């Protein structure tokens with residue numbers, strides 16, 4: 001990991017060379033590898049020299065404080081490294097208020113609770129279909145056989161995209177969150193745009209009721225959304241639809257495959273699933289992005305200079321022992337589940353109703369049919385970090401005679 005030379009305004013004792021794309025002991029799990037930032041030795045604000053050099057807030061309180069302070073911590077450059085944050089132009093995420101407010105309203109229209117409730121029957125049926133089909137085999141590669149097809153196919157149906165384009169779209173979205181290096185962020189962004197611009201154009205000529213039609217034919221400030229804004233908005237929805245829930249589901253199922261007491265609780269008390277969903281979202285939070293400083297700022301005794309970037313990992317607040325006692329322990333009866341998994345401040349995630357509904361459906365439908373399962377013997381479940389953290393592969397095994405037709 002290359003280290004950028006230490007800027008002169010940054011003092012030595014705050015330096016902690018954390019690589020957000022390669023955190024230390026990832027074999028303990030990516031959330032526990034990020035939590036090394038909250039170890040005993042570690043200041044609450046640190047400078048890392050990796051990825052061009054940037055600050056990191058490591059505590060839930062400072063993360064929330066920064067997220068509620070867009071006048072100082074701007075969304076104009078929200079990704080590390082700078083080159084990616086500079087090329088990030090998705091809408092509404094790259095706008096500060098009040099400008100982002102009306103775009104947020106358009107985006108919210110296509111993935112909001114009215115749309116989730118409209119899709120619920122599609123969501124239920126595809127999840128049951130996927131889990132039937134594999135129920136009698138006694139094994140699966142969960143990432144490939146459920147975690148990817150279930151949320152992506154729902155998102156493609158909501159956006160009206162053939163699905164068939166999934167391999168290409170999935171590969172581009174991955175490039176922007178956990179890059180492999182064969183493309184810059186801008187190169188993946190520009191390929192996503194070449195895909196989207198003709199569909200947007202096609203859909204102003206022949207509108208359907210899908211999400212891309214509704215955006216391209218939308219309005220901000222009483223005037224038509226432009227072609228330029230429509231593709232930056234549609235692009236954002238495509239990266240969240242393809243690379244968030246997908247990764248999160250694998251984390252949960254890996255947890256449940258090692259935790260029979262937790263499985264039984266959700267089978268015997270199905271009304272507990274929504275609360276367990278919240279506690280799995282805290283424990284297996286997976287997003288981390290950042291902000292750029294609009295001005296010099298003395299932040300809890302540390303001088304941040306105009307143009308510094310600061311990583312404010314959304315996943316860290318709920319792993320913070322100051323927010324949740326015994327934070328690595330999953331407790332479905334936790335009296336207060338404190339987290340910022342879906343963000344904080346004016347950018348709080350718009351697709352979170354879709355995500356919760358997909359997570360709850362996975363939990364209920366998988367456990368109604370495959371109540372007993374395990375990680376394959378001698379399998380290594382390998383994690384991966386980035387803007388969105390993930391799981392490489394999750395081989396599960398189970399006895400088909402202990403499954404259930406429903």
Ligand code: HEM
Nearest residue numbers: 092093237240244245248287314342343347349350351355
């Ligand atoms: C477990 C699943 C998900 C998690 C943890 C998650 C996380 C987040 C986080 C942390 C942010 C704030 C980023 C920032 O402050 O810069 C955000 C924003 C956003 N997310 Fe999600 N997301 C998930 C699923 C989805 C899905 C499926 C969609 C569907 C399109 C989506 C759409 C959006 C949008 C549109 C925004 C921008 C809101 C704004 O900037 O005003 N998310 N998400």
Ligand SMILES: CC1(C)[C@H]2CC(=O)[C@]1(C)C[C@H]2O
Nearest residue numbers: 093239240244287289387388
């Ligand atoms: C940070 C996000 C999770 C959020 C904004 C992004 O770029 C994401 C990676 C997808 C979208 O939902």
Ligand SMILES: [K+]
Nearest residue numbers: 076088089094
């Ligand atoms: K920008």
